[PDB]
Design a protein around this ligand. Structure first.
Ligand SMILES: COc1cc2ncnc(Nc3ccc(F)c(Cl)c3)c2cc1OCCCN1CCOCC1
Ligand SMILES: COc1cc2ncnc(Nc3ccc(F)c(Cl)c3)c2cc1OCCCN1CCOCC1
Lengths: 306, 124
């Protein structure tokens, strides 16, 4: 049992980790809180037991991505990883161990625990998120997260935001072409819908006859929805109406005076055509000018959430 | 749950001198908790100093205090202790005891709830 794994001591290189708690249940791979008996340092440990080579190469690519993104203040710090051959495993299930730094918890958790959020709070939250994405798009080749939601935003022990789950990421861009046959468009949409959830789908992955590019601009749409959620406490496409996503039909609260400064960014990130959406660099620049004109350091720890 | 931690034993101490901190616990199971001492150094913030396993099988310290400090515990009385020796001016701070350990670069998991005890390493 994945729950009876608590109390076990896992050896990972020089580390001898005691499994203390269950942090998350993903069905395929639990996430545990682990503590080294030789140093006392605590970690988060992801453990995959699977034979399916699709999940295996997924977590292998997941590891390589984190090593590339290591050292960034807004991305969760990679520690170590190891895999055990199916032949040599204890249960005869191929074992993969993924170890990263331990955070305080999910942003969502520390959100509902605390009237509404001030503009300075939303500014720090969103800016530190966009810095993480910016660092991913800066790589060679660029890294596209594709699974950007508030559930994947963590709050560090320092009080800053850390982006965490990179299992869905990719470095391949897809450009629907004249040479794309009618059934190729059909097969691709199936593959996307089986790996996605309605409310998080983008216009470019719903209509595959629009010839919209499917790449980096996906994240900007996701960031656009995040900023909306941070302000108005709801997803702009929560109900999952695919008719409203493709047509970009959402509604900013009519008489909202509190988050007026963010209306320009929301409208500019939620553009149906990816080629009309702001780049990640343009997003950061506008945020920095908002922070400068509000006398706020956007990289500073968010004490309100602590 | 209610967590009640209370530190004491600090005060004005001289460089190269010694001191002995203590902490009482209640409202949780002290026998099922990795216990740590953390300090709040002025101009630096919070940092992890020392830690001990729930069964005292392992004791951990930060590099700047190894060999000089000694942590211990008594589960029967729910008491945590820190024996400090060869105190340097850098050891000056506000000391707390917390549950669980740390992450990354000596950054504590649990951010103090108690008032803590003051430790001042001064040459009078
Ligand atoms: C103490 O709180 C956490 C610290 C964490 N520190 C680091 N990483 C986390 N998640 C995570 C995410 C993806 C990964 F690949 C790995 Cl290795 C770890 C963490 C998740 C944590 O909590 C998980 C949140 C899932 N909760 C579980 C309870 O119900 C609401 C959903
Ligand atoms: C939220 O997750 C996704 C979003 C996606 N969003 C857009 N496109 C995807 N794939 C894709 C693949 C081929 C194509 F030609 C095109 Cl156009 C798109 C996506 C794939 C996604 O998941 C791919 C598989 C990720 N899992 C992670 C762990 O389990 C095994 C692999």
């Amino acid at each position: 049992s994945q729950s009876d794994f608590v109390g076990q001591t896992v050896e990972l290189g020089e580390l001898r980790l005691r499994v203390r708690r269950v942090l998350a249940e993903g069905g395929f791979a639990f996430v545990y809180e682990a503590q080294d008996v030789g140093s006392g340092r605590e970690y988060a440990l992801k453990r995959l037991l699977s034979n399916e080579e699709e999940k295996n190469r997924a977590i292998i690519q997941e590891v390589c991505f984190m090593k590339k993104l290591s050292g960034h203040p807004n991305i969760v710090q990679f520690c170590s990883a190891a895999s055990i051959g199916k032949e040599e495993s204890d249960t005869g299930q191929a074992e993969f161990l993924l170890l990263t730094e331990l955070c305080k918890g999910q942003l969502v958790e520390f959100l509902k625990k605390m009237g509404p959020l001030s503009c300075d709070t939303v500014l720090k939250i969103f800016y530190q998120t966009c810095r993480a994405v910016q660092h991913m798009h800066r790589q060679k080749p660029p890294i596209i997260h594709r699974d950007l939601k508030v559930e994947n935003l963590l709050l560090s022990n320092q009080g800053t935001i850390k982006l965490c789950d990179f299992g869905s990421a990719t470095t391949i861009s897809h450009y629907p072409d004249y040479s794309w046959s009618a059934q190729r468009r059909a097969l691709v949409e199936e593959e996307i819908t089986r790996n996605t959830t309605p409310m998080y789908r983008t216009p470019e992955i719903i209509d595959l006859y629009s010839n919209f590019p499917i790449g980096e601009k996906q994240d900007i749409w996701a960031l656009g929805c995040i900023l909306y959620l941070l302000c108005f406490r709801q997803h702009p496409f929560e109900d999952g109406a695919k008719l409203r996503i493709v047509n970009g039909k959402y509604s900013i609260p009519p008489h909202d005076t509190q988050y007026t400064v963010f209306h320009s960014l929301i409208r500019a990130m939620l553009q149906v055509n990816p080629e009309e959406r702001l780049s990640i660099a343009e997003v950061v620049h506008q945020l920095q000018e908002i922070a400068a004109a509000r006398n706020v350091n956007p990289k500073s720890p968010i004490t309100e959430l602590l | 749950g209610q967590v009640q931690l209370q530190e004491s034993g600090g005060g004005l101490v001289q460089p190269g001198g010694s001191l002995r901190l203590s902490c009482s616990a209640s409202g949780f199971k002290f026998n099922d908790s990795y216990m740590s001492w953390v300090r709040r150094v002025p101009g630096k913030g919070l940092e992890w100093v020392a830690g001990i396993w729930e069964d005292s099988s392992a004791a951990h310290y930060r590099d700047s205090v190894k060999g000089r400090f000694t942590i211990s515990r008594d589960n029967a009385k729910n008491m945590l202790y820190l024996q400090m020796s060869s105190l340097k001016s850098d050891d000056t701070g506000l000391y707390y005891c917390v549950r669980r350990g740390y992450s990354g670069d000596y950054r504590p998991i649990n951010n103090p709830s108690s008032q803590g005890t003051q430790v001042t390493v001064s040459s009078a």
